[PDB]
Amino acid sequence: MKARELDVPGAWEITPTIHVDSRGLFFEWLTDHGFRAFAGHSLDVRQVNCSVSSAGVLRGLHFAQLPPSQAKYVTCVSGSVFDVVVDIREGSPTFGRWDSVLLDDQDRRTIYVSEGLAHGFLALQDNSTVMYLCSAEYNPQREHTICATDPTLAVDWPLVDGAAPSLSDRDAAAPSFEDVRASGLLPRWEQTQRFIGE
Amino acid sequence: MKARELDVPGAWEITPTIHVDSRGLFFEWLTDHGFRAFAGHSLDVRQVNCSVSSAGVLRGLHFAQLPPSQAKYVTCVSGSVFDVVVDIREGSPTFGRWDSVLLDDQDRRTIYVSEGLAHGFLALQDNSTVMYLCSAEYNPQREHTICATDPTLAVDWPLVDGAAPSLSDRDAAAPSFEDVRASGLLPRWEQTQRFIGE
Numbered sequence: 383m384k385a386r387e388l389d390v391p392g393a394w395e396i397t398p399t400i401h402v403d404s405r406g407l408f409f410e411w412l413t414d415h416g417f418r419a420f421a422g423h424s425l426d427v428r429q430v431n432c433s434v435s436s437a438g439v440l441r442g443l444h445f446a447q448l449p450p451s452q453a454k455y456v457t458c459v460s461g462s463v464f465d466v467v468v469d470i471r472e473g474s475p476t477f478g479r480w481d482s483v484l485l486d487d488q489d490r491r492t493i494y495v496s497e498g499l500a501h502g503f504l505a506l507q508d509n510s511t512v513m514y515l516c517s518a519e520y521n522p523q524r525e526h527t528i529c530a531t532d533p534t535l536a537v538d539w540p541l542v543d544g545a546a547p548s549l550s551d552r553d554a555a556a557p558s559f560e561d562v563r564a565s566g567l568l569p570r571w572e573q574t575q576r577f578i579g580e
Numbered sequence: 581m582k583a584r585e586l587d588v589p590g591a592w593e594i595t596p597t598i599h600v601d602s603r604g605l606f607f608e609w610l611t612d613h614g615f616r617a618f619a620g621h622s623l624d625v626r627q628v629n630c631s632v633s634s635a636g637v638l639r640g641l642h643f644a645q646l647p648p649s650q651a652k653y654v655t656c657v658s659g660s661v662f663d664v665v666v667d668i669r670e671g672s673p674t675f676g677r678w679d680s681v682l683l684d685d686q687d688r689r690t691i692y693v694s695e696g697l698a699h700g701f702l703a704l705q706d707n708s709t710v711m712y713l714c715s716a717e718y719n720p721q722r723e724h725t726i727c728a729t730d731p732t733l734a735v736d737w738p739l740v741d742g743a744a745p746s747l748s749d750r751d752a753a754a755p756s757f758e759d760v761r762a763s764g765l766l767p768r769w770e771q772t773q774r775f776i777g778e
């Protein structure tokens with residue numbers, strides 16, 4: 383496996399070694415040794431989630447308050463999604479910036495999203511299945527949303543086909559980035575570095 | 581999430597709570613609290629593997645020498661597979677017996693296979709994708725095979741079109757159950773008992 387840090391520090395694109403034969407294929411999606419090699423610690427898998435989405439569905443932008451927040455190791459096992467990470471860590475040299483990766487069933491790449499980042503994706507095909515390992519169990523009181531189409535964040539969603547994305551009631555009602563900043567819920571860059579440092 | 585122990589003790593069929601909405605669906609595949617509730621301890625996820633198989637491909641029968649062997653939390657995220665667990669624990673009250681779970685992208689069930697059991701599946705459709713969480717990283721020295729079509733184990737594989745299974749060179753060369761019994765590589769029942777007890 384190869385791991386490339388994104389333009390948003392603390393997020394990485396992972397490339398698997400896919401072993402192909404006449405039967406189909408095989409890959410190691412995560413290994414403890416492989417994960418430690420880029421992250422500097424083991425991933426404490428406390429939950430694993432799965433979602434299936436039709437074309438044009440946008441889920442996000444989601445984060446978990448620090449501490450302990452929720453790191454996510456995310457991949458697409460059918461179809462394809464345009465996946466985005468946003469630096470919402472107040473004080474970060476890259477605060478308010480975002481990066482993206484294409485997660486699909488062809489190249490079978492992965493994004494690791496460390497603690498205190500925001501994350502979302504737009505499904506590009508019907509029946510796009512996403513699985514993700516989580517560093518913390520579901521905590522709906524500590525998990526929050528930011529409007530995925532926030533004009534300050536200005537995420538360049540490749541809308542299908544420029545048509546508005548289809549959102550949950552939750553995500554459609556998501557507050558502006560401005561409002562989330564006023565709430566005090568965003569993690570601090572210093573806090574997040576210290577936390578991962580420990 | 582509901583767990584039903586199979587006729588082979590130490591293997592469970594897990595049924596998800598599937599949350600359907602306008603977008604598609606979401607489910608919590610593993611939670612720490614849910615896993616502990618049936619297994620009695622937390623799953624130490626040290627590796628996660630993915631395979632994709634064409635119809636009639638059989639992968640198995642596979643096991644890992646105890647200790648620590650390798651527990652597996654297995655699900656099918658596209659297509660469908662007939663998944664089998666075999667009690668290979670010498671001294672077990674159910675030694676030599678097997679049970680099965682239908683893993684597919686419809687009911688989205690999971691089988692948990694504890695340490696010291698054998699496991700395999702037969703793919704029932706093309707593009708069938710199986711993902712499994714592992715309690716131990718790949719150990720080629722301590723991972724072993726048993727012929728999937730062994731006459732004593734007599735596993736009733738629902739052969740696709742009645743045709744012979746498509747096997748890897750490793751699985752096609754797998755020794756008979758007899759040979760494995762003589763080898764000393766099988767775990768003992770009370771050995772698995774105290775290992776999982778601890």
Ligand SMILES: Cc1cn([C@H]2C[C@H](O)[C@@H](COP(=O)(O)OP(=O)(O)O[C@H]3O[C@@H](C)[C@H](O)[C@@H](O)[C@H]3O)O2)c(=O)[nH]c1=O
Nearest residue numbers: 431433441442444454501502503520550552599606608
């Ligand atoms: C996130 C989550 C949702 N649910 C349930 C509640 C709802 O009935 C259903 C859908 O919930 P939603 O919050 O709308 O799921 P979603 O698929 O929009 O949320 C996910 O989006 C990703 C982009 C983020 O990276 C994830 O952290 C997560 O927030 O799933 C859980 O049971 N456990 C969970 O951990």
Ligand SMILES: Cc1cn([C@H]2C[C@H](O)[C@@H](COP(=O)(O)OP(=O)(O)O[C@H]3O[C@@H](C)[C@H](O)[C@@H](O)[C@H]3O)O2)c(=O)[nH]c1=O
Nearest residue numbers: 401408410629631639640642652699700701718748750
């Ligand atoms: C199991 C495993 C295999 N491999 C390698 C060896 C091969 O090049 C390629 C495919 O290996 P195979 O042994 O043919 O994979 P397989 O899909 O036949 O093996 C799997 O079958 C399941 C039924 C068992 O429960 C698992 O424990 C595992 O053994 O991947 C790994 O690299 N890591 C692993 O953890």
